[PDB]
């Protein structure tokens, strides 16, 4: 219903009545749908070239030679063009014309977003989802958090709020992943720690940007994958006064 507001030193200096977006029931299925839809819409087309394994003029020898009826090169016995021939085409490969985009209705997507926002208030979900913190949820900060311009200032605020331990666990649990992702450019497996939500584009977006595991966004740029990384709700989030004021009819 109501939440205390903490100054940059971390002390409650007032009250704010939480909007109706915060008393929304918990819908893990819809959160899963929203996150999967966002990932699919982010996904990228791929596939082999048009005639890969197929630019040969190979034809079969027929019967009467003691060999399989597969197409062969016109001037050698090397088989070609068939999916079970060496150098042959992939049978049923990925198509660049394949459509991986998912549609979720706007109403149920906003319902899922509201569910995730309300899940950001429950201490049990947030701690079950892996975060380390000692504050009392939800954490609403006075607007002067948005005006601080340096990572050191963000560190001071997080330490005063008892949130820097989750940034530290994210930093020291960042780890090089196993497999081909390293070669493809996904060398590390990163953790998610803290979601700062600001009223509008302010210096805090840039000041908190480099924090390990931290995402800093505005209410306009708030979505299901930010509020529930990996389809798991219970994200540790710092709301600002402007953000709480602007969340009045954000998804209703």
């Amino acid at each position: 219903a109501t939440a205390k507001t903490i100054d940059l030193t971390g002390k409650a200096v007032g009250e704010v009545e939480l909007p109706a977006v915060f008393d929304a029931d918990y819908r893990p299925d819809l959160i899963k749908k929203a996150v999967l839809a966002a990932q699919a819409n982010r996904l990228q087309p791929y596939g082999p070239r048009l005639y890969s394994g197929m630019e040969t003029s190979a034809r079969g020898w027929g019967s009467g030679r003691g060999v399989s009826h597969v197409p062969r090169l016109v001037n050698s016995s090397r088989a070609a063009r068939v999916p079970h021939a060496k150098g042959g085409r992939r049978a049923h490969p990925p198509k660049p014309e394949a459509d991986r985009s998912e549609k979720v209705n706007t109403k149920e997507r906003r319902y899922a977003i509201r569910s995730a926002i309300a899940a950001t208030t429950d201490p049990t979900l947030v701690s079950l989802r892996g975060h380390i913190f000692e504050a009392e949820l939800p954490i609403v900060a006075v607007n002067d958090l948005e005006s601080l311009e340096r990572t050191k200032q963000v560190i001071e605020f997080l330490e005063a709020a008892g949130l820097y331990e989750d940034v530290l666990r994210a930093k020291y649990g960042r780890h090089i992943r196993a497999g081909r992702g390293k070669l493809r450019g996904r060398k590390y497996k990163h953790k998610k720690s803290v979601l700062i939500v600001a009223g509008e584009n302010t210096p805090i977006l840039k000041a908190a940007r480099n924090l390990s595991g931290v995402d800093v966004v505005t209410v306009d740029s708030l979505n299901a994958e930010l509020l529930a990384p990996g389809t798991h709700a219970g994200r540790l989030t710092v709301w600002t006064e402007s953000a709480i004021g602007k969340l009045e009819g954000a998804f209703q």
Partner: protein, 119 residues
């Protein structure tokens, strides 16, 4: 130089491998000592044949010597005293990476060296 335009390992390694010679010059950079960095305003400079550096990583940490040679294609330097004794028994020099050493004395016989190191 490789910008955050491309964060892909393939493009980074391609850029390094096909770097031109004027870019491989910058690959010879090494950390300056505390006095040198204070009195130059930059934290690093390119190792040159002749100046004294201290090796701070590898089998030869702590050795100070003059750069005998520099290979830009290999990205290696040859320092007085950093040698491998071969099966003959003769001493061949062991090439080092400039990022494993620290400049303690600069060679300033070239008037262009100051702006070369900075600006």
């Amino acid at each position: 130089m490789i910008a955050m335009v491309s964060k892909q390992p393939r493009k980074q390694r391609k850029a390094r491998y096909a770097a031109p010679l004027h870019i491989r010059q910058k690959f010879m950079g090494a950390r300056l000592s505390e006095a040198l960095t204070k009195e130059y305003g930059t934290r690093s400079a390119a190792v040159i044949t002749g100046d004294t550096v201290k090796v701070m990583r590898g089998d030869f940490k702590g050795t100070e010597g003059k750069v005998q040679s520099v290979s830009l294609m290999d990205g290696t330097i040859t320092v007085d005293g950093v040698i491998s004794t071969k099966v003959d028994g003769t001493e061949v020099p062991r090439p080092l990476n400039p990022s494993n050493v620290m400049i303690t004395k600069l060679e300033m016989k070239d008037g262009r060296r100051a702006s070369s190191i900075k600006k």
